[PDB]
Amino acid sequence: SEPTSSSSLDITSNCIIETPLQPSDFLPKSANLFPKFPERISVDSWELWEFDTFDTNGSVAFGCSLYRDARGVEQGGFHAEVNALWPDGTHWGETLYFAVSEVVENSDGTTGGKWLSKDGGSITFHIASDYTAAALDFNVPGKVSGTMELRNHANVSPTSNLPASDAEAQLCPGVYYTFPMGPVATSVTATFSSVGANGESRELFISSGYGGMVRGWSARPWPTFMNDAYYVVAQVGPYMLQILRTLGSVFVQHKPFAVARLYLDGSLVSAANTVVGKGDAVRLTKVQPDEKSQGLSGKFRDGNVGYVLEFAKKDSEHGWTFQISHKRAVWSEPTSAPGPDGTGKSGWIEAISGGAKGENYEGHGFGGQLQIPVP
Amino acid sequence: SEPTSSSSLDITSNCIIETPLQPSDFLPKSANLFPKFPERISVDSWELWEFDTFDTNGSVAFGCSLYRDARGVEQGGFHAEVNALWPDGTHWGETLYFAVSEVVENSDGTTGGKWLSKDGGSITFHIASDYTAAALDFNVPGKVSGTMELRNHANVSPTSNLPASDAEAQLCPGVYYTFPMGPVATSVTATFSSVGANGESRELFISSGYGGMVRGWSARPWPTFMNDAYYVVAQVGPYMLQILRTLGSVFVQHKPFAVARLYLDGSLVSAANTVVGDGDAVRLTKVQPDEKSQGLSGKFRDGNVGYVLEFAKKDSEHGWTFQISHKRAVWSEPTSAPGPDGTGKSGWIEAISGGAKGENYEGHGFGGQLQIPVP
Amino acid sequence: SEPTSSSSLDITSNCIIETPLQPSDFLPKSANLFPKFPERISVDSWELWEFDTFDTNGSVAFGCSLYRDARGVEQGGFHAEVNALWPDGTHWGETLYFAVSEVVENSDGTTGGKWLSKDGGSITFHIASDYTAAALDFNVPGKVSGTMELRNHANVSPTSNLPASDAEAQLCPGVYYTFPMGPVATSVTATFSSVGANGESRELFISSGYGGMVRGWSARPWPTFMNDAYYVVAQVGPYMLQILRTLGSVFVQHKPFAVARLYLDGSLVSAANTVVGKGDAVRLTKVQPDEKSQGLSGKFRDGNVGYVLEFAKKDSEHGWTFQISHKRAVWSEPTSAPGPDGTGKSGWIEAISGGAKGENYEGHGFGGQLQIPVP
């Protein structure tokens, strides 16, 4: 509970270098929660600690992505992307900025994080030494206050499933993207200062909610390996799934990449770090509204109404397939100038069905898709 | 005095490396005229020493931008952009390539530079230890010979206004763009061997010309932080202004940046390193021909006939506003294949008017705009 | 003899770093066959050992490009492009991925290479210490087995013609592209398990064939310096020519580059490392089907039916001009989504004629062109 490792960066006091930085090495069988760029970042480098929640029916969602990268220097802070959805369709969403990001590892092996702004507002996290619990405290004046908790209850420990090699931790060479907590039950108690029309509103998820945690980092900037991405975490009957799939920019010859994990009754049954042309592999196919009647489209040039997600087992014909349809729109922000080819990012409360061949379990997910106009 | 530090690069002998280099650190309250990549240029690094002049009436102009740029090296050497405009509208413009670029700092604190080619041809500059004077000598056989001088006569020294921090010296992280001489009186006496359809011309500005000097450098190549730029140096009654404004490419999330300086009869009255986001800030708005009748358009996809330039003073409602109209075309070169979306660069002898509330000064500027086909 | 230098890379074990690596320095008057990134590759770097063959009549072709390439590693391993063409027009072509790539230099000065996969399949090469002979062995289960030989019989040695400076070995700064064996006679005996309608077929090129060898490497990825390339090796009467000619992407301001060599009965008579507006220069002009009736087009947006290739002496005004027309299609693969601006790569068995003024020699070449969808 005394700090034994400490990284503290102040984006307003010269911690950005304009040439590449190599991160600290990946640690096998660790959740690698301590920053990999501990003293300085480059204009390219990024680190992500992400915690999302939603209730079992998908009527409410609350997510928080904490970043260290240089995108927010002009706003004076590291990014904290906070998004909330109520049962009535109201959405609250902001990129919040915090001049200081401090992450410590304590002697007991717990990890603490603190995004701190000059006015004293903060978002903090605290993660158990064995990665089975995470707690966030929000204290952002005039924006959002409250708490979020994620807990793993599975039989097999988080540690048992942690990547043992760089390949198992990687989206692609040099891009690390990991789901170290696996299946989590969630709870939220939060208050938002102004929602919809200048009014305060509270939000609750009770210890019975779903969600997921993401730990990611890279020296490589996103445009150099992707121009389209999809992320979701979901519960579909007894299945717990989590996936990031990128579609490459021209700088990786438009190659797709994915990191994906599938649990069944709390046990890992599929781990994929490759796309169907190591462990397993995944295929992710966009669904168009001329193919499937149910599902919203986002507001930009990507008109898909959902996806088909297939987990293919290495040895066999036995796999798992999930139909994902966009059920409720969360966030929506452009990533280019408007127009017929304008791109953007859209968050979703997904309706998902499927499982093994013949199965038709039904559940929900929380995630989002993004394009940026990189060739 | 003899040279006390010396940077000499020669395109025949390993002057460029295929991986990134961090420049030497920015020096506070210095003009930073000595090369920031003194032993070798990197795959993407560029350094700029620029000296532009025009006469009080805008009838003649003469500009020279000296580069150490990996792009120029790939194209033949250390390069100089040289552009002249005569009262009848004839333009002379060439990119000149040199095998050797040498910059020294001397014991007395002066800075000397020499772009030199095999055949003896050369462009040299000599800058005073206190940056109040700069002299160029042109001796390029069959192209141009003569001299250029800039002399600052302000009672407040150039050093007093020099950037004291990376913030004040930067367009954006790692991109340095500075106007260390401030307001200068200029003169030029040059002969050009062939102008128009046959024929030698002299070109003269009497010490009572206007213009300005630019010192810039970065490890980051221009396409990674911009795809559209406007630069101008101008005199408008008692005002002397200098501004670069970039609009970002996808690689900086389309963020706009600016470095701008406004002097009032020799004293700095507004310093901006930020764009207004609806030191001080600047707003730069393009003007289209359906809005304003007076002004030329460039020959490429950017159809604007000028700009509105506003300096917004921190905490005040009252700033300065300048109307910029494209009066005379200088240089015009494509930067993509031609077509409806073809990009290019255009130089201008802009007609500029305005000032603070109640002011209507009128003057001229020398500048240019540029697009490149990067999303 | 025993290895005195060894570089062995394994995709299971930290073979690629996510930040730039500088290669080992170019060695003057060496074929530089040992890997320039010997301990690991970077996420940008690539290295090429390429060996191509065709018969004198242009009825059959067999080529093998061996790579260590970050893009290939991202896509499965150290890759080999293997392409074959039979007299009836049947083409066989695959990209093969290998877990291990090993190159050694032995005490006798020979260079040995081994692309090796988990199942024991391999492609090996062995190159003589004076670069006059090279032999490849293919042992790829279910794909291809056999041998390819290249031998130089010129009275002037390969060593006499090797580049002596970084400039003579370069396409552009930092991109090395070399033809160290010069003119070679070739021989192939190969068997392919499945070609056309699932049928194995043998392929024979008697020690009376033509072809060429390429050795290239760079820390700079292809999109950052090109978006269109043409490569060919050919025999036209007593002439043996070899050229790469790239057209720049926006990241090198669309500048064209070339590396080209022309031999007359075994002696180097033109070495060009520059495009027509140091040694000589080359001009490479596309020919359109509205200009010339004979010649195929590729299947993508580049509709050319051939090229005009001119070698220009600096210190005279004669040179050599060759007419290149696409005779037979070898490989054809898209490099973008399909459509009116869809790009791709096309291999060809070229018909080539020409020479100096008053010459009309006729022969054949093996090569290809490619575009990548980078502005």
GROMACS .gro file of N, CA and C in nm, chain B residues 69-196:
model
  384
  444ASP      N    1   1.645   2.007  -4.596
  444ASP     CA    2   1.522   1.928  -4.594
  444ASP      C    3   1.555   1.794  -4.659
  445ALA      N    4   1.511   1.684  -4.597
  445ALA     CA    5   1.529   1.553  -4.658
  445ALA      C    6   1.464   1.547  -4.797
  446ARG      N    7   1.349   1.614  -4.814
  446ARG     CA    8   1.282   1.619  -4.944
  446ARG      C    9   1.369   1.688  -5.049
  447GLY      N   10   1.432   1.800  -5.014
  447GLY     CA   11   1.522   1.866  -5.108
  447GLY      C   12   1.642   1.780  -5.143
  448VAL      N   13   1.698   1.711  -5.043
  448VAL     CA   14   1.810   1.620  -5.067
  448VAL      C   15   1.770   1.511  -5.166
  449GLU      N   16   1.653   1.448  -5.144
  449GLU     CA   17   1.606   1.346  -5.238
  449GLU      C   18   1.592   1.402  -5.378
  450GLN      N   19   1.567   1.533  -5.391
  450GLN     CA   20   1.547   1.596  -5.521
  450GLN      C   21   1.674   1.657  -5.580
  451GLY      N   22   1.786   1.656  -5.507
  451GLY     CA   23   1.910   1.703  -5.566
  451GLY      C   24   2.006   1.781  -5.478
  452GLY      N   25   1.962   1.833  -5.364
  452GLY     CA   26   2.057   1.901  -5.278
  452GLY      C   27   1.987   1.982  -5.171
  453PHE      N   28   2.066   2.064  -5.103
  453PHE     CA   29   2.010   2.161  -5.010
  453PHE      C   30   1.953   2.276  -5.091
  454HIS      N   31   1.827   2.309  -5.068
  454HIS     CA   32   1.757   2.386  -5.169
  454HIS      C   33   1.718   2.524  -5.118
  455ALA      N   34   1.698   2.613  -5.215
  455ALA     CA   35   1.654   2.749  -5.191
  455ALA      C   36   1.537   2.777  -5.284
  456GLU      N   37   1.430   2.833  -5.229
  456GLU     CA   38   1.319   2.881  -5.311
  456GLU      C   39   1.339   3.031  -5.329
  457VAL      N   40   1.354   3.075  -5.455
  457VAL     CA   41   1.382   3.214  -5.488
  457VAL      C   42   1.273   3.267  -5.580
  458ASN      N   43   1.206   3.374  -5.538
  458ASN     CA   44   1.093   3.428  -5.611
  458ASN      C   45   1.099   3.580  -5.613
  459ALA      N   46   1.078   3.637  -5.732
  459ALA     CA   47   1.081   3.781  -5.754
  459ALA      C   48   0.960   3.822  -5.836
  460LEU      N   49   0.914   3.945  -5.811
  460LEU     CA   50   0.800   4.000  -5.883
  460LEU      C   51   0.830   4.145  -5.920
  461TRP      N   52   0.807   4.183  -6.049
  461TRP     CA   53   0.833   4.318  -6.099
  461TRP      C   54   0.702   4.398  -6.112
  462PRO      N   55   0.711   4.531  -6.121
  462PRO     CA   56   0.589   4.612  -6.132
  462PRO      C   57   0.501   4.578  -6.251
  463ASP      N   58   0.557   4.529  -6.362
  463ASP     CA   59   0.468   4.492  -6.473
  463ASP      C   60   0.401   4.356  -6.453
  464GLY      N   61   0.426   4.288  -6.341
  464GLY     CA   62   0.365   4.158  -6.318
  464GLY      C   63   0.449   4.038  -6.358
  465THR      N   64   0.569   4.058  -6.412
  465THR     CA   65   0.648   3.942  -6.447
  465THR      C   66   0.701   3.875  -6.322
  466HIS      N   67   0.695   3.743  -6.321
  466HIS     CA   68   0.743   3.662  -6.209
  466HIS      C   69   0.865   3.583  -6.253
  467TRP      N   70   0.966   3.579  -6.167
  467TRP     CA   71   1.079   3.487  -6.178
  467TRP      C   72   1.079   3.396  -6.056
  468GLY      N   73   1.074   3.265  -6.078
  468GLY     CA   74   1.082   3.176  -5.964
  468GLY      C   75   1.155   3.048  -5.994
  469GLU      N   76   1.248   3.008  -5.907
  469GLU     CA   77   1.317   2.881  -5.925
  469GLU      C   78   1.349   2.818  -5.790
  470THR      N   79   1.344   2.685  -5.786
  470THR     CA   80   1.404   2.610  -5.677
  470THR      C   81   1.548   2.579  -5.716
  471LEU      N   82   1.643   2.628  -5.638
  471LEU     CA   83   1.784   2.609  -5.668
  471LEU      C   84   1.842   2.504  -5.574
  472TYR      N   85   1.923   2.413  -5.627
  472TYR     CA   86   1.977   2.303  -5.548
  472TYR      C   87   2.128   2.319  -5.530
  473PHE      N   88   2.176   2.295  -5.408
  473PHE     CA   89   2.317   2.313  -5.377
  473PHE      C   90   2.373   2.188  -5.311
  474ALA      N   91   2.498   2.156  -5.344
  474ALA     CA   92   2.560   2.037  -5.290
  474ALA      C   93   2.603   2.054  -5.145
  475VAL      N   94   2.633   2.177  -5.102
  475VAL     CA   95   2.686   2.199  -4.969
  475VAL      C   96   2.603   2.305  -4.897
  476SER      N   97   2.574   2.281  -4.769
  476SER     CA   98   2.511   2.379  -4.682
  476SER      C   99   2.593   2.389  -4.555
  477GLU      N  100   2.647   2.508  -4.529
  477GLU     CA  101   2.733   2.532  -4.415
  477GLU      C  102   2.679   2.649  -4.334
  478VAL      N  103   2.660   2.628  -4.204
  478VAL     CA  104   2.619   2.734  -4.113
  478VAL      C  105   2.720   2.736  -3.999
  479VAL      N  106   2.775   2.854  -3.970
  479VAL     CA  107   2.867   2.871  -3.859
  479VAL      C  108   2.811   2.974  -3.763
  480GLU      N  109   2.845   2.958  -3.635
  480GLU     CA  110   2.835   3.067  -3.541
  480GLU      C  111   2.978   3.111  -3.508
  481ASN      N  112   3.002   3.242  -3.515
  481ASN     CA  113   3.136   3.299  -3.499
  481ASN      C  114   3.157   3.347  -3.356
  482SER      N  115   3.284   3.375  -3.325
  482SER     CA  116   3.321   3.419  -3.190
  482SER      C  117   3.244   3.543  -3.146
  483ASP      N  118   3.223   3.638  -3.237
  483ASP     CA  119   3.150   3.759  -3.204
  483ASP      C  120   2.999   3.737  -3.195
  484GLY      N  121   2.952   3.614  -3.215
  484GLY     CA  122   2.811   3.586  -3.200
  484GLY      C  123   2.730   3.599  -3.326
  485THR      N  124   2.790   3.644  -3.435
  485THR     CA  125   2.721   3.644  -3.562
  485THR      C  126   2.701   3.501  -3.612
  486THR      N  127   2.605   3.484  -3.703
  486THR     CA  128   2.577   3.358  -3.770
  486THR      C  129   2.598   3.374  -3.920
  487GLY      N  130   2.676   3.284  -3.979
  487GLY     CA  131   2.699   3.285  -4.122
  487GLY      C  132   2.649   3.156  -4.185
  488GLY      N  133   2.592   3.169  -4.303
  488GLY     CA  134   2.539   3.054  -4.374
  488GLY      C  135   2.581   3.062  -4.519
  489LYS      N  136   2.596   2.944  -4.579
  489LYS     CA  137   2.648   2.934  -4.715
  489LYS      C  138   2.590   2.808  -4.779
  490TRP      N  139   2.504   2.828  -4.879
  490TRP     CA  140   2.456   2.726  -4.972
  490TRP      C  141   2.541   2.734  -5.097
  491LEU      N  142   2.614   2.627  -5.128
  491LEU     CA  143   2.726   2.631  -5.220
  491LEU      C  144   2.723   2.510  -5.312
  492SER      N  145   2.746   2.532  -5.441
  492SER     CA  146   2.743   2.423  -5.537
  492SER      C  147   2.879   2.406  -5.603
  493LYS      N  148   2.890   2.290  -5.669
  493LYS     CA  149   3.013   2.246  -5.736
  493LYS      C  150   3.078   2.359  -5.814
  494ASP      N  151   3.003   2.419  -5.907
  494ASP     CA  152   3.043   2.526  -5.999
  494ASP      C  153   3.081   2.656  -5.929
  495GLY      N  154   3.089   2.668  -5.796
  495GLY     CA  155   3.118   2.795  -5.733
  495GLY      C  156   2.996   2.879  -5.696
  496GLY      N  157   2.880   2.854  -5.757
  496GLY     CA  158   2.758   2.926  -5.723
  496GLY      C  159   2.723   2.921  -5.576
  497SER      N  160   2.657   3.026  -5.525
  497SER     CA  161   2.636   3.030  -5.381
  497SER      C  162   2.528   3.131  -5.345
  498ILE      N  163   2.464   3.107  -5.230
  498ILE     CA  164   2.383   3.204  -5.159
  498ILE      C  165   2.433   3.202  -5.016
  499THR      N  166   2.467   3.319  -4.962
  499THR     CA  167   2.517   3.330  -4.826
  499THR      C  168   2.430   3.425  -4.746
  500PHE      N  169   2.427   3.405  -4.615
  500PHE     CA  170   2.368   3.502  -4.525
  500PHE      C  171   2.462   3.530  -4.410
  501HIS      N  172   2.448   3.648  -4.352
  501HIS     CA  173   2.524   3.687  -4.235
  501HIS      C  174   2.428   3.763  -4.145
  502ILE      N  175   2.413   3.717  -4.021
  502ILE     CA  176   2.318   3.774  -3.927
  502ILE      C  177   2.394   3.827  -3.806
  503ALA      N  178   2.353   3.945  -3.760
  503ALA     CA  179   2.416   4.012  -3.646
  503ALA      C  180   2.399   3.932  -3.518
  504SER      N  181   2.494   3.951  -3.426
  504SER     CA  182   2.488   3.881  -3.298
  504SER      C  183   2.362   3.915  -3.218
  505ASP      N  184   2.306   4.035  -3.236
  505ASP     CA  185   2.182   4.071  -3.169
  505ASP      C  186   2.061   4.066  -3.261
  506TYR      N  187   2.077   4.008  -3.380
  506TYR     CA  188   1.966   3.980  -3.472
  506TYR      C  189   1.901   4.106  -3.527
  507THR      N  190   1.967   4.222  -3.517
  507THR     CA  191   1.909   4.345  -3.570
  507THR      C  192   1.939   4.365  -3.718
  508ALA      N  193   2.018   4.276  -3.778
  508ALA     CA  194   2.055   4.293  -3.918
  508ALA      C  195   2.084   4.159  -3.981
  509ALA      N  196   2.045   4.144  -4.108
  509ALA     CA  197   2.077   4.026  -4.186
  509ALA      C  198   2.110   4.068  -4.329
  510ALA      N  199   2.214   4.008  -4.387
  510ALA     CA  200   2.254   4.040  -4.523
  510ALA      C  201   2.271   3.911  -4.600
  511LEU      N  202   2.212   3.906  -4.719
  511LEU     CA  203   2.230   3.793  -4.808
  511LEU      C  204   2.304   3.838  -4.933
  512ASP      N  205   2.387   3.749  -4.986
  512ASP     CA  206   2.456   3.770  -5.112
  512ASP      C  207   2.422   3.655  -5.204
  513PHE      N  208   2.377   3.688  -5.325
  513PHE     CA  209   2.336   3.590  -5.423
  513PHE      C  210   2.439   3.590  -5.535
  514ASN      N  211   2.486   3.472  -5.571
  514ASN     CA  212   2.585   3.465  -5.678
  514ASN      C  213   2.567   3.329  -5.745
  515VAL      N  214   2.463   3.321  -5.827
  515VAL     CA  215   2.421   3.197  -5.892
  515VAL      C  216   2.431   3.217  -6.042
  516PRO      N  217   2.537   3.165  -6.105
  516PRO     CA  218   2.565   3.198  -6.246
  516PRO      C  219   2.448   3.168  -6.337
  517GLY      N  220   2.414   3.263  -6.424
  517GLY     CA  221   2.304   3.244  -6.516
  517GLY      C  222   2.166   3.245  -6.453
  518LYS      N  223   2.155   3.284  -6.325
  518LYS     CA  224   2.027   3.286  -6.256
  518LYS      C  225   2.004   3.421  -6.190
  519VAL      N  226   2.076   3.449  -6.082
  519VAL     CA  227   2.053   3.571  -6.005
  519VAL      C  228   2.182   3.609  -5.933
  520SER      N  229   2.212   3.738  -5.930
  520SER     CA  230   2.318   3.789  -5.845
  520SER      C  231   2.272   3.919  -5.782
  521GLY      N  232   2.320   3.945  -5.661
  521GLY     CA  233   2.290   4.070  -5.595
  521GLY      C  234   2.285   4.051  -5.445
  522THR      N  235   2.216   4.143  -5.379
  522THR     CA  236   2.219   4.148  -5.233
  522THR      C  237   2.081   4.180  -5.177
  523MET      N  238   2.062   4.138  -5.052
  523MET     CA  239   1.941   4.161  -4.974
  523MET      C  240   1.981   4.195  -4.832
  524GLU      N  241   1.916   4.296  -4.773
  524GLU     CA  242   1.939   4.331  -4.634
  524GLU      C  243   1.806   4.348  -4.562
  525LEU      N  244   1.799   4.300  -4.438
  525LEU     CA  245   1.693   4.329  -4.343
  525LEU      C  246   1.758   4.399  -4.222
  526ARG      N  247   1.700   4.511  -4.177
  526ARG     CA  248   1.756   4.584  -4.060
  526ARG      C  249   1.645   4.626  -3.963
  527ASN      N  250   1.649   4.575  -3.839
  527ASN     CA  251   1.553   4.611  -3.735
  527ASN      C  252   1.603   4.739  -3.668
  528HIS      N  253   1.516   4.840  -3.663
  528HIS     CA  254   1.549   4.971  -3.605
  528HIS      C  255   1.467   5.004  -3.480
  529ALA      N  256   1.395   4.907  -3.425
  529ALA     CA  257   1.307   4.931  -3.312
  529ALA      C  258   1.387   4.961  -3.185
  530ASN      N  259   1.328   5.041  -3.098
  530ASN     CA  260   1.395   5.074  -2.973
  530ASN      C  261   1.397   4.955  -2.878
  531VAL      N  262   1.291   4.874  -2.877
  531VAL     CA  263   1.295   4.747  -2.805
  531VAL      C  264   1.367   4.645  -2.892
  532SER      N  265   1.470   4.581  -2.836
  532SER     CA  266   1.555   4.490  -2.912
  532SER      C  267   1.478   4.365  -2.956
  533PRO      N  268   1.523   4.300  -3.064
  533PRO     CA  269   1.469   4.167  -3.097
  533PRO      C  270   1.478   4.067  -2.982
  534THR      N  271   1.590   4.068  -2.908
  534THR     CA  272   1.605   3.970  -2.800
  534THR      C  273   1.493   3.979  -2.697
  535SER      N  274   1.447   4.101  -2.666
  535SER     CA  275   1.343   4.116  -2.564
  535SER      C  276   1.215   4.042  -2.600
  536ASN      N  277   1.186   4.026  -2.730
  536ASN     CA  278   1.064   3.961  -2.775
  536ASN      C  279   1.083   3.813  -2.807
  537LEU      N  280   1.206   3.762  -2.805
  537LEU     CA  281   1.230   3.624  -2.844
  537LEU      C  282   1.152   3.528  -2.755
  538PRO      N  283   1.101   3.418  -2.810
  538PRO     CA  284   1.035   3.315  -2.728
  538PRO      C  285   1.121   3.273  -2.610
  539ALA      N  286   1.057   3.261  -2.493
  539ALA     CA  287   1.127   3.217  -2.374
  539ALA      C  288   1.099   3.071  -2.339
  540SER      N  289   1.008   3.006  -2.412
  540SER     CA  290   0.968   2.869  -2.383
  540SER      C  291   0.932   2.798  -2.513
  541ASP      N  292   0.935   2.665  -2.507
  541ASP     CA  293   0.891   2.585  -2.621
  541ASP      C  294   0.754   2.628  -2.667
  542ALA      N  295   0.665   2.659  -2.572
  542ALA     CA  296   0.531   2.705  -2.606
  542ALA      C  297   0.536   2.822  -2.705
  543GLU      N  298   0.614   2.925  -2.672
  543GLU     CA  299   0.615   3.047  -2.752
  543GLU      C  300   0.686   3.026  -2.885
  544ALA      N  301   0.771   2.923  -2.896
  544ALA     CA  302   0.847   2.900  -3.017
  544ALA      C  303   0.782   2.801  -3.111
  545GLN      N  304   0.671   2.739  -3.071
  545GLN     CA  305   0.618   2.623  -3.140
  545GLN      C  306   0.489   2.651  -3.214
  546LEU      N  307   0.479   2.595  -3.334
  546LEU     CA  308   0.350   2.579  -3.398
  546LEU      C  309   0.268   2.470  -3.330
  547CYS      N  310   0.333   2.360  -3.296
  547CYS     CA  311   0.274   2.246  -3.229
  547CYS      C  312   0.390   2.163  -3.174
  548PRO      N  313   0.363   2.057  -3.097
  548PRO     CA  314   0.475   1.987  -3.031
  548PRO      C  315   0.582   1.944  -3.129
  549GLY      N  316   0.706   1.985  -3.103
  549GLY     CA  317   0.814   1.944  -3.191
  549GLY      C  318   0.829   2.023  -3.319
  550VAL      N  319   0.738   2.116  -3.350
  550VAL     CA  320   0.746   2.195  -3.473
  550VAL      C  321   0.772   2.339  -3.433
  551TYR      N  322   0.889   2.389  -3.469
  551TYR     CA  323   0.936   2.519  -3.424
  551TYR      C  324   0.930   2.616  -3.541
  552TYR      N  325   0.871   2.732  -3.517
  552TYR     CA  326   0.849   2.832  -3.620
  552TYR      C  327   0.853   2.969  -3.553
  553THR      N  328   0.950   3.053  -3.591
  553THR     CA  329   0.985   3.170  -3.511
  553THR      C  330   1.017   3.286  -3.604
  554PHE      N  331   0.999   3.408  -3.553
  554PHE     CA  332   1.023   3.531  -3.628
  554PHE      C  333   1.121   3.616  -3.547
  555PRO      N  334   1.248   3.574  -3.539
  555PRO     CA  335   1.338   3.635  -3.440
  555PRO      C  336   1.381   3.778  -3.471
  556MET      N  337   1.375   3.824  -3.596
  556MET     CA  338   1.413   3.961  -3.626
  556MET      C  339   1.300   4.061  -3.605
  557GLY      N  340   1.175   4.016  -3.602
  557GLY     CA  341   1.064   4.107  -3.587
  557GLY      C  342   1.058   4.208  -3.701
  558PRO      N  343   1.007   4.328  -3.674
  558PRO     CA  344   0.988   4.426  -3.782
  558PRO      C  345   1.121   4.473  -3.839
  559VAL      N  346   1.135   4.464  -3.972
  559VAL     CA  347   1.259   4.498  -4.038
  559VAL      C  348   1.232   4.590  -4.158
  560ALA      N  349   1.323   4.685  -4.178
  560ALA     CA  350   1.333   4.760  -4.303
  560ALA      C  351   1.421   4.681  -4.399
  561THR      N  352   1.381   4.674  -4.524
  561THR     CA  353   1.449   4.587  -4.618
  561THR      C  354   1.501   4.666  -4.737
  562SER      N  355   1.602   4.610  -4.802
  562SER     CA  356   1.647   4.658  -4.932
  562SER      C  357   1.702   4.541  -5.010
  563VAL      N  358   1.696   4.555  -5.142
  563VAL     CA  359   1.740   4.453  -5.236
  563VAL      C  360   1.800   4.522  -5.357
  564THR      N  361   1.915   4.473  -5.403
  564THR     CA  362   1.966   4.508  -5.535
  564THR      C  363   2.009   4.379  -5.602
  565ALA      N  364   1.940   4.339  -5.709
  565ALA     CA  365   1.971   4.212  -5.772
  565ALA      C  366   1.957   4.225  -5.923
  566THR      N  367   2.030   4.137  -5.995
  566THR     CA  368   2.016   4.120  -6.139
  566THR      C  369   1.976   3.976  -6.168
  567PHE      N  370   1.877   3.957  -6.254
  567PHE     CA  371   1.834   3.826  -6.300
  567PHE      C  372   1.869   3.810  -6.447
  568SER      N  373   1.929   3.696  -6.482
  568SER     CA  374   1.983   3.677  -6.617
  568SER      C  375   1.873   3.669  -6.723
  569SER      N  376   1.766   3.596  -6.697
  569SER     CA  377   1.660   3.577  -6.796
  569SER      C  378   1.526   3.584  -6.725
  570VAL      N  379   1.441   3.678  -6.767
  570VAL     CA  380   1.311   3.705  -6.707
  570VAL      C  381   1.209   3.717  -6.820
  571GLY      N  382   1.089   3.661  -6.799
  571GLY     CA  383   0.988   3.665  -6.905
  571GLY      C  384   1.032   3.585  -7.026
   0.00000   0.00000   0.00000
